Design a protein around this ligand. Structure first.
Ligand SMILES: Nc1ncnc2c1ncn2[C@@H]1O[C@H](COP(=O)(O)OP(=O)(O)OC[C@H]2O[C@@H](O)[C@H](O)[C@@H]2O)[C@@H](O)[C@H]1O
Ligand SMILES: Nc1ncnc2c1ncn2[C@@H]1O[C@H](COP(=O)(O)OP(=O)(O)OC[C@H]2O[C@@H](O)[C@H](O)[C@@H]2O)[C@@H](O)[C@H]1O
Ligand SMILES: [Mg+2]
Ligand SMILES: [Mg+2]
Ligand SMILES: [Mg+2]
Lengths: 313, 432, 48, 24, 48
């Protein structure tokens, strides 16, 4: 009966002439002002509240004379660590790869228009809309904070070895970490360090967060190192999008490069000893579906992963 | 009956029990006079309740949500140790029965089948059954099962602990005011009280009334109940099995807490409502059979909306997220279907839930010996034999052989003797 | 009667993917020399 | 079971956007 | 039993049990009695 179902969906399911008749059912309800506005209370800030704005008042093209954002910078960022840009953002070149202390920083946004520089103070302006709050907040770098996300995937298989199938598509499973700060599940990842690329960053954040191997457990075996290197040798950049991250401001926003490491056979994925470390509490394999409640725009990232792999979502 | 002045509480080391005064022990339990209060005041509401047509009296303790579950566990152990001596029959299984308090409305054939499975599991494992303390629904049904169980037993009677949120109990006002040892207070289920309307079940042998300073609010005892069962499971080295039949929103929260504390759950499919929602969610996420390939998140959302009535998108999202969070770990959920599968396979589901845990390896073999499933024990031993682990098998094989001898299971005796259990290297549990 | 929120969502999901398969002249018996019926045909296929 | 495995690998497995993270 | 419909089953279970008794079908009598047909709640077809 399983084979009959499988042959039936492989033979029936293998802009121009496309019509949408949903207006007959709904009416005036359609996709209107599909735009992200971050929550009023800034995370980990001790009660500073943003300037509340409606979702139809977010993009820069629309006029907004009553726009009065609050200037807030977190004390950790204001204490000046190694990964934080200087408080006066002048002489910094945006939209091109910039060298800070001989180390390369990306600073280029995926927005087609680019980053616009305010003439009065020299600080960058977020091209993806208003967030009701200026300053850097929890983000250390002016402009684009480059993040790399690691979606390590394998096919969801039963004990008999058959891949699980829902809605006529094969079902995926991804490694998800529980964040320390807001306790909601998310894709492992972190900000791109100075002088390093997305390749080192994606892999490093996955070992530190998902595996906890950042000076916190023990040295890997030579076959475990070979298996993890084999897993990490074939990665595809599935998306490079703007994050719907609640820490985003008008002068500092997170933009992610998403790297998918898919384990087709499942041999390399089974040798991973998941244990939450660094800024992750717990790590587990979690089924990919459209009803997932994840941090920021990680559902969009998982949509891109399933779109690339022709998986269920 | 002479009131106790001193009680025997077992030490935290687990090596012996020290005798201490009752007011000193009972100081660690708190009550809230109002919602605003956080630190609280000493509880002073403990003693025994006398029910009509019941010969024995049932203990009650009013504690606070912030109180340690180990202390409540020490209280239950201390009373049983006082009444039946030090060598009372320890539980090898904690069976939690949860589900619908009022909306429970089930066909009689289905009720007899579920009742039959619970009665045999309870009678074979000498289980402590912890349900809700009220006289409605699945709690009342489980109470009837243990009422019938209480007659054929001669010495030891397994407690039927009822954990209910205090503040909904009609005799709550009569229990708190007065002296601290209340010996034999009469509980009147038919007595009128305007604000509260939920009475205690007369067939439950013990009562933990969890209080958080709330009148007529439910679901405040869920976290403490899961934590108390988990604490009991660690203390007696016994698996805890939660059983879910029908249920509303608080049953979903009960299952969520149970799966968060590592306790396996047994979901009875086909009984309707939250059990069907949990079973549908598990079958959608894990089951490889052909008939579950049409299962979708949309139909699951439709089921949650039709069952729970969330009345808002955010509430529906939270309920759906909680339901999907329950069946995230496939080992911790075992779905038993009442209709399609057989009548005598409920104990196999309970044993599968026991076997699905991580530790208590000697104990898991003991549970397999109690349920008379020789094949399960044989498969576990063969898999264990292939997987190395020689030290743990040799460490528990003697005690398992000893246990097999005590409960008159010769097939288990031959099976354990074939797997390098030296007959002359057995050791007694106590010291002569 | 008014449809349920899941029935409205199901019908909207069915109606969101339609393909215009043909735009032909009808062989309708009410056709005249000065008034004729021409049809646009919309196919809503439910694969699952 | 052999046919199930064969159909599964024929349906799942039938420079640009390629990244090497072995350096980590 | 799986499809709900408890009112129609309870409404016809008594008459079905009664009919099973009249035509000497004991297996049907045990089967109808197992599905919540109260033995003492039967009713005759005519009025005395
Ligand atoms: N440019 C930076 N901005 C902010 N914090 C930084 C930066 N660089 C380093 N840090 C340090 O890293 C810590 C954050 O941990 P990471 O794992 O590096 O980053 P994370 O909190 O996971 O944020 C990135 C996550 O947000 C999502 O938008 C994005 O998809 C990614 O998943 C911070 O506490 C801070 O100390
Ligand atoms: N423990 C209870 N006892 C009596 N009545 C209750 C209880 N909990 C809730 N009620 C009330 O009864 C009504 C029906 O409850 P159900 O939906 O049948 O069950 P549920 O709401 O899930 O609560 C059941 C309770 O049983 C326990 O095993 C579990 O802790 C859960 O809290 C609800 O509207 C509720 O107001
Ligand atoms: Mg991170
Ligand atoms: Mg980091
Ligand atoms: Mg990190």
């Amino acid at each position: 009966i399983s084979f009959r179902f499988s042959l039936d969906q492989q033979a029936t399911k293998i802009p121009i002439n496309r019509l949408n008749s949903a207006v007959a059912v709904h009416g005036h309800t359609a996709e209107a002002a599909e735009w992200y506005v971050p929550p009023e209370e800034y995370p980990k800030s001790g009660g500073v509240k943003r300037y509340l704005i409606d979702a139809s008042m977010v993009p820069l093209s629309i006029m907004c004379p009553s726009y009065d954002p609050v200037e807030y910078t977190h004390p950790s960022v204001a204490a000046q660590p190694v990964w934080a840009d200087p408080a006066d953002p002048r002489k910094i070149k945006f939209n091109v790869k910039d060298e800070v202390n001989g180390k390369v920083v990306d600073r280029t946004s995926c927005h087609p228009s680019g980053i616009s520089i305010d003439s009065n103070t020299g600080r960058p302006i977020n091209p993806w809309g208003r967030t009701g709050m200026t300053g850097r907040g929890l983000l250390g770098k002016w402009g684009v904070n480059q993040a790399a996300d690691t979606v390590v995937t394998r096919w969801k298989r039963s004990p008999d070895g058959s891949i699980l199938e829902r809605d006529g598509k094969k079902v995926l499973e991804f490694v998800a970490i529980q964040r320390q700060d807001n306790k909601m599940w998310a894709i492992p990842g972190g900000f791109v360090d100075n002088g390093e690329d997305v390749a080192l960053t994606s892999g490093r954040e996955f070992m530190e967060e998902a595996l906890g191997m950042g000076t916190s457990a023990d040295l890997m075996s030579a076959e475990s190192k070979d298996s993890l290197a084999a897993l990490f040798s074939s990665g595809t950049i599935v998306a490079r999008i703007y994050c719907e991250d609640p820490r985003n401001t008008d002068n500092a926003w997170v933009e992610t490069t998403c790297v998918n490491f898919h384990d087709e056979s499942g041999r390399h994925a089974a040798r991973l000893k998941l244990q939450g470390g660094d800024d992750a509490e717990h790590a587990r394999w979690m089924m990919v579906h459209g009803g997932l409640n994840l941090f920021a725009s990680h559902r969009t990232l998982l949509q891109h992963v399933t779109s690339a792999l022709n998986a269920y979502f | 009956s002479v009131a106790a002045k001193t009680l025997l509480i077992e030490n935290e080391d687990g090596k012996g029990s020290t005798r201490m005064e009752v007011q000193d022990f009972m100081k660690r339990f708190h009550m809230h006079a109002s919602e605003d209060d956080k630190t609280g005041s000493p509880s002073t509401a403990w003693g025994t309740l006398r029910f009509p047509t019941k010969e024995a009296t049932a203990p009650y303790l009013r504690l606070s949500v912030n109180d340690d579950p180990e202390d409540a566990l020490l209280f239950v152990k201390a009373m049983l140790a006082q009444k039946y001596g030090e060598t009372y029959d320890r539980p090898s299984l904690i069976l939690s029965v949860t589900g619908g308090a009022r909306n429970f409305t089930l066909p009689p054939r289905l009720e007899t089948a579920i009742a039959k499975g619970l009665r045999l599991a309870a009678q074979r494992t000498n289980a402590w059954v912890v349900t809700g303390g009220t006289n409605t629904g699945v709690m009342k049904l489980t109470g009837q099962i243990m009422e019938a169980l209480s007659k054929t037993q001669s010495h030891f009677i397994p407690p039927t602990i009822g954990i209910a949120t205090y503040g909904v109990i009609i005799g709550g006002d009569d229990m708190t005011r007065g002296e601290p040892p209340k010996i034999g207070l009469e509980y009147e289920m038919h007595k009128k009280d305007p604000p509260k309307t939920t009475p205690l079940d007369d067939n439950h042998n013990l009562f933990l009334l969890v209080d958080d300073g709330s009148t007529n609010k439910f679901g405040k005892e869920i976290k403490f109940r899961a934590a108390f069962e988990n604490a009991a499971g660690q203390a007696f080295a016994a698996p805890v099995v939660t059983i879910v039949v029908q249920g509303g929103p608080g049953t979903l929260g009960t299952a969520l807490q149970a799966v968060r504390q590592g306790t396996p759950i047994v979901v009875v499919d086909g009984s309707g409502l939250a059990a069907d929602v949990l079973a549908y969610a598990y079958n959608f996420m894990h089951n490889p059979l052909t008939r579950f390939k049409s299962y979708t998140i949309d139909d699951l959302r439709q089921k949650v909306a039709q069952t729970f009535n969330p009345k808002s998108s955010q509430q529906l999202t939270n309920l759906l997220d909680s339901a999907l969070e329950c069946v995230q770990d496939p080992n911790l959920v075992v779905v038993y279907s009442l209709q399609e599968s057989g009548i005598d396979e409920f104990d196999d589901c309970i044993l599968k839930a026991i076997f699905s845990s991580q530790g208590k390896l000697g104990n898991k073999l003991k549970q397999a010996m109690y349920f008379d499933q020789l094949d399960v024990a044989k498969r576990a031993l063969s898999e264990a034999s292939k997987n190395g682990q020689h030290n743990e098998i040799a460490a528990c094989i003697n005690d398992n052989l000893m246990a097999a001898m005590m409960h008159n299971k010769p097939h288990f005796v031959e099976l354990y003797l074939g797997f390098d259990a030296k007959i002359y290297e057995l050791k007694p549990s106590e010291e002569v």
